[PDB]
Write a protein that binds this ligand. Structure first.
Ligand SMILES: CC(=O)N[C@@H]1[C@@H](O[C@@H]2O[C@@H](C)[C@@H](O)[C@@H](O)[C@@H]2O)[C@H](O[C@@H]2O[C@H](CO)[C@H](O)[C@H](O[C@H]3O[C@H](CO)[C@H](O)[C@H](O)[C@H]3NC(C)=O)[C@H]2O[C@@H]2O[C@@H](C)[C@@H](O)[C@@H](O)[C@@H]2O)[C@@H](CO)O[C@H]1O
Length: 572
């Protein structure tokens, strides 16, 4: 019964995936795609982050036959268990999560098919450093006994004080079915008993189907109604492939034709905009794909990891996400029903998202409206999804607008928590600047942001603390030689091996950094020229900010030219 680790707002969790190389396994070698090693990867994790990071082993393309995944996993669990801090000579077992269920555990899709619950129990009993087990990405192959197996995984985890972590997306009603929509109620009953050992996450890979907002809505509602211990999200740069995009801002769709160029192209900073929707809504668990771009290769951090993910995750440790109690206080509307019966992701389009195919929000006015599926009992206005208020886009806004007041101006995403305004430009692949006006009591702040830019503005006793991130390297080189979508589509494949090699040779080193680009901050109601203090950020990525003080108009324009992360205080 005693939990093997804490997972909550004060103890968030960053999953650190390591994918087995099946080809090398057949040759009797135990290696991961991308050249990370279990020991090397752990060692390279910053020490301040080690208490909040867990290695997630994934069986990837291990042989699809009995014994392959057990063999590889036992080998790795041994390595984790016997690790010695280099250093202090102490045996310090590396915490691990095993991926045990994926692709419906179909024998034609995954070696994970041949990991029995009996075997998992044995592993939990042998390895105290095994902290949880992971199911991921079954929406597209919703196997006959998936709910029965999920109940078994939750129970075996609870039996051992571990966590069952499930990353899933509401495609084909997956989240609704999980809890009993179609009559498979084993997991519903398991959760009644064992929800304290459950973590539920979204998995935003299938971006063409547009279920980001409804899945995240459920994740948050399930948490608030005690149907999961904590929640979070797996954010996946493959969304760029799923939606058929190519060169940044280029016109034309290439569909699903250049996978390995496409998962490299999502702007680095956009992952932080996605991760804000988790943080701002009380979520505390984070995971990413494709691992080579989002984390790195060869036991080294990629620039996406170092400049965006690591900074962001350090931020949510230093400033714990809002507690359940606080999210629950702030919630004005809680939806009960199946989004699959109301157009799915379309439910929120032109309410708080700008389109079907996006992982971002266009306003923070309602934050994320929480919901649970209609199969669950209840158990703040709790509203049936079939209410007249939800019948249309306009009904939704009118009803919501009475309970959630407008608290900023401008066509841009912004949400406030205590003394802090969180802002981002919500454009995905369109080069449009956005502006907003935010207030901290009597201090008025305007911002102008280009796409793929987020900021956190905190009112402090003597001024304003600013953290900015617009890190976005230039990916055009991947799309060289293609003057349009037709030509792009016909490029020679980068391939998986080729994309790992591109990261090694052109991203880890010889990086094509993006151009510096302008952010404006305008303060109004100001007496004196403010001064800048504690200025730091990504090495070689910013000019000294320029200020223009208009004394008569009690305003100052701050102009920033940068491409990276940045922080400073303004005193006034
Ligand atoms: C019909 C079909 O082939 N299935 C698609 C899924 O993935 C494939 O099938 C499973 C069984 C695996 O064999 C996987 O390797 C296949 O690609 C899709 O799931 C993810 O989809 C993206 C595309 O959006 C990728 O295929 C991704 O896998 C690739 O990247 C990961 C790292 O991010 C690994 O490097 C994989 O080896 C690589 N695959 C290939 C062929 O290069 C898929 O993610 C993987 O598989 C899923 C099921 C899950 O286990 C993840 O944790 C894992 O990373 C799905 C997308 O909606 O579409 C299916 O049609």
């Amino acid at each position: 019964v005693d939990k093997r680790r804490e997972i909550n707002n004060e103890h968030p969790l960053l999953m650190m995936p390591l994918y087995a190389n099946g080809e090398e396994f057949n040759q009797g070698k135990y290696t991961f795609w991308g050249g990370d090693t279990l020991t090397g990867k752990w060692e390279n994790i910053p020490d301040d982050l080690k208490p909040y990071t867990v290695i997630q082993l994934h069986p990837d393309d291990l042989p699809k036959r009995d014994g392959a995944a057990r063999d590889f996993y036992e080998h790795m669990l041994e390595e984790a268990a016997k690790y010695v801090n280099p250093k202090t000579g102490k045996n310090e077992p590396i915490p691990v999560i095993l991926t045990v269920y994926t692709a419906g555990n179909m024998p034609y899709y995954t070696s994970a098919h041949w990991l029995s619950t009996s075997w998992i129990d044995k592993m939990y009993q042998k390895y105290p450093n095994l902290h949880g087990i992971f199911s991921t990405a079954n929406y597209w192959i919703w196997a006959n006994d998936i709910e029965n197996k999920a109940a078994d995984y939750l129970k075996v985890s609870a039996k051992n004080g571990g966590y069952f972590i499930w990353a899933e997306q509401n495609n084909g009603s997956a989240i609704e079915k999980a809890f009993g929509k179609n009559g498979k109620i084993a997991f519903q009953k398991s959760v009644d008993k064992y929800w304290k050992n459950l973590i539920f996450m979204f998995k935003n890979t299938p971006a063409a189907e547009g279920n980001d907002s409804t899945t995240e809505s459920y994740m948050k509602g399930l948490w608030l109604s005690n149907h999961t211990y904590q929640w979070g999200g797996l954010m996946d740069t493959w969304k760029w492939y799923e939606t058929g995009k190519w060169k940044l801002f280029a016109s034309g769709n290439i569909g699903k034709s250049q996978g390995d160029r496409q998962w490299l192209t999502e702007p680095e900073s956009m992952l932080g905009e996605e991760a804000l929707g988790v943080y701002l809504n009380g979520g505390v668990v984070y995971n990413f794909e494709h691992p080579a771009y989002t984390y790195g290769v060869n036991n080294k951090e990629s620039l996406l990891f170092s400049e965006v993910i690591k900074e962001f995750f350090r931020y949510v440790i230093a400033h714990p996400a809002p507690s359940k109690e606080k999210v629950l206080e702030d919630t004005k509307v809680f939806i009960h029903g199946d989004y699959s019966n109301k157009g799915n992701g379309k439910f929120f389009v032109n309410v708080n998202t700008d389109r079907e195919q996006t992982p971002l929000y266009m306003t923070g006015r309602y934050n994320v409206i929480p919901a649970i599926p209609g199969v669950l009992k209840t158990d703040i206005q709790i509203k049936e999804i079939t209410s007249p208020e939800f019948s249309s886009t306009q009904a939704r806004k009118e009803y919501l607008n009475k309970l959630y007041p407008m608290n900023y101006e401008g066509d841009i995403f912004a949400q406030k928590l205590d003394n802090r305004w969180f802002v981002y430009n919500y454009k995905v692949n369109e080069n449009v600047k956005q502006t907003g006006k935010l207030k901290f009591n009597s201090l008025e702040m305007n911002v102008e942001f280009e796409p793929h830019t987020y900021g956190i503005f905190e009112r402090i006793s003597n001024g304003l603390k600013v953290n900015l991130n617009n890190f976005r390297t230039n990916k055009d080189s991947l799309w060289s030689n293609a003057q349009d979508a037709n030509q792009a589509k016909k490029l020679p494949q980068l391939t998986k091996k080729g994309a790992i090699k591109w990261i090694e040779e052109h991203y880890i080193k010889d990086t094509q950094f993006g151009e510096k680009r302008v952010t404006k901050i305008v303060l109004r109601g100001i007496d004196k020229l403010p001064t800048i203090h504690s200025l730091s950020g990504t090495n070689n990525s910013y000019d000294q900010p320029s200020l223009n003080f208009d004394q008569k108009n009690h305003m100052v324009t701050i102009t920033i030219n940068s491409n990276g992360n940045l922080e400073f205080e303004l005193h006034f």
